């Protein structure tokens, strides 16, 4: 595969600058930060989201629309996102523009300016959208599959936070989150595409060299009944192994075996925890039959796998998790997480080796370890009266 | 749990075996108690 290895050179502050040169002419230079809603302490539950809104509204060097203007003029796309564990600010731009794609990113992580005036507006923006964020039923289901599964922990609370905090937030608080969770050893400068690693390392030395230097799963159930909705969304999960756990790969193959309606499957991983399960949307009348169907399948893998199907699963995984030339953005993203989670970029050859070592016996062993006789977390929203209660799903978790 | 409470099959075996012995044991103890009372 002649994979372009990801050369990662570290910095004094610890930016762990990394890179994976590629022929593509445009590149994606991003900053990842190990800071999410898991690091918030319920008094600043929307600080990362609201800082993610404020981060493009001007820094000392780029007051007002300067930031957006320049990153617009250069012709680059500026994006940012926040999860429960990671925050990313990345720019897709013509490689030659690295010089500015990097200096701009430096401002966004440090020297940022949180104009109180702007703060006011972003508050309104976040709040109002949240007032409508309820339209994204799936996100709702998935932010309760989190609340009821991680009750009492910082992993239950959402990325956006409760409207309460959103309204009650001030520059100083933000400043704290910014000055507390934006440390240089918890930061990765990732570059993918037409970039040279030595030039990127010199730019990180020139700019960004200033950056300062028991989660538990609770088998439970939340049922939001609202019978006026046309469709019902139900998510059932168990405790995922984690990000670093080796068995994650044998679980991905299991998901590739499974693949009523919109019956997706997810393996969300956080630092030594996670949610492994399925989300499906169905007319109310069929919710119970779906559930029965789904539980039977998990059970099928646990006791009755087949090399053929495993193969089907290994192959789909193989065509997946490539993140290679899939594009600068995706690749950079993967590197961004790989340096934050694993501490290194796992190459695709190692992924292929870990895929080909998976057989049917260890797949049903790992599935029995993680699915069989486990207490799930259930989150339902919509006409969910025929959704079975916890004893029936409890009993369907075993044969 | 890892021997008789993991999968229904295992659970079944212990039940059968345990019941097999409990029967005699119960009667035996009853003998003492019954004789004790009388």
């Amino acid at each position: 595969q002649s994979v372009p290895e990801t050369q990662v050179s570290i910095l004094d502050n610890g930016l762990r600058v990394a890179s994976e040169q590629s022929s593509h002419a445009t590149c994606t230079v991003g900053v990842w930060i190990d800071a999410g809603s898991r690091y918030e302490t319920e008094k600043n539950n929307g600080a990362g989201y609201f800082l993610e809104h404020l981060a493009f509204k001007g820094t000392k060097n780029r007051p007002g629309n300067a930031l957006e203007k320049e990153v617009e003029s250069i012709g680059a796309h500026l994006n940012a996102y926040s999860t429960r564990e990671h925050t990313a600010y990345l720019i897709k731009a013509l490689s030659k523009d690295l010089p500015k794609v990097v200096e701009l990113l430096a401002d966004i992580v440090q020297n940022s300016s949180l104009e109180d005036s702007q703060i006011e507006k972003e508050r309104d923006v976040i709040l109002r959208e949240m007032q409508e964020n309820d339209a994204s039923m799936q996100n709702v289901v998935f932010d309760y599959l989190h609340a009821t599964a991680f009750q009492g922990t910082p992993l239950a609370q959402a990325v956006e936070g409760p409207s309460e905090n959103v309204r009650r937030l001030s520059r100083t608080d933000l400043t704290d989150y910014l000055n507390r969770h934006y440390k240089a050893p918890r930061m990765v400068l990732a570059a993918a595409g037409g970039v040279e690693h030595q030039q990127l390392l010199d730019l990180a030395q020139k700019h960004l060299s200033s950056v300062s230097r028991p989660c538990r799963f609770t088998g439970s159930e939340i049922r939001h009944r609202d019978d006026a909705l046309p469709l019902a969304h139900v998510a059932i999960a168990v405790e995922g192994p984690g990000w670093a756990n080796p068995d994650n790969v044998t679980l991905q193959v299991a998901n590739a075996i499974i693949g009523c309606q919109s019956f997706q499957t997810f393996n969300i991983s956080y630092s030594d925890t996670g949610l492994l399960g399925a989300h499906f949307v169905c007319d109310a009348m069929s919710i119970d039959d779906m559930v029965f169907f789904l539980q039977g399948q998990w059970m099928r893998l646990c006791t009755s796998a087949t090399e053929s199907e495993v193969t089907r699963g290994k192959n789909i995984l193989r065509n997946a998790l490539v993140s290679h030339l899939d594009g600068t953005t995706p690749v950079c993203e993967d590197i961004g997480r790989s340096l934050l989670t694993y501490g290194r970029r796992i190459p695709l050859a190692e992924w292929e080796s870990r895929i080909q070592e998976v057989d049917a016996q260890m797949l049903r062993d790992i599935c029995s370890k993680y699915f069989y006789d486990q207490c799930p977390a259930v989150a339902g929203y919509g006409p969910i009266e025929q959704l079975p209660d916890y004893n029936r799903i409890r009993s369907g978790m075993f044969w | 749990y890892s021997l008789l409470f993991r999968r229904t099959s295992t659970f079944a075996l212990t039940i059968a075996v345990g019941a097999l012995f409990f029967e005699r044991a119960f009667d035996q103890g009853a003998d003492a108690i019954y004789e004790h009372i009388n």
């Binding site: 007032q131 956006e160 409207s163 939001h224 | -």
Partner: peptide, 21 residues
């Protein structure tokens, strides 16, 4: 929306090893 109120605390009920339980 869907985040303002959190899971009510079941601590009292919670039996503050799973295999054992």
């Amino acid at each position: 929306s869907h985040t303002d109120v959190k899971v009510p605390d079941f601590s009292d009920y919670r039996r503050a090893s799973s295999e054992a339980r």
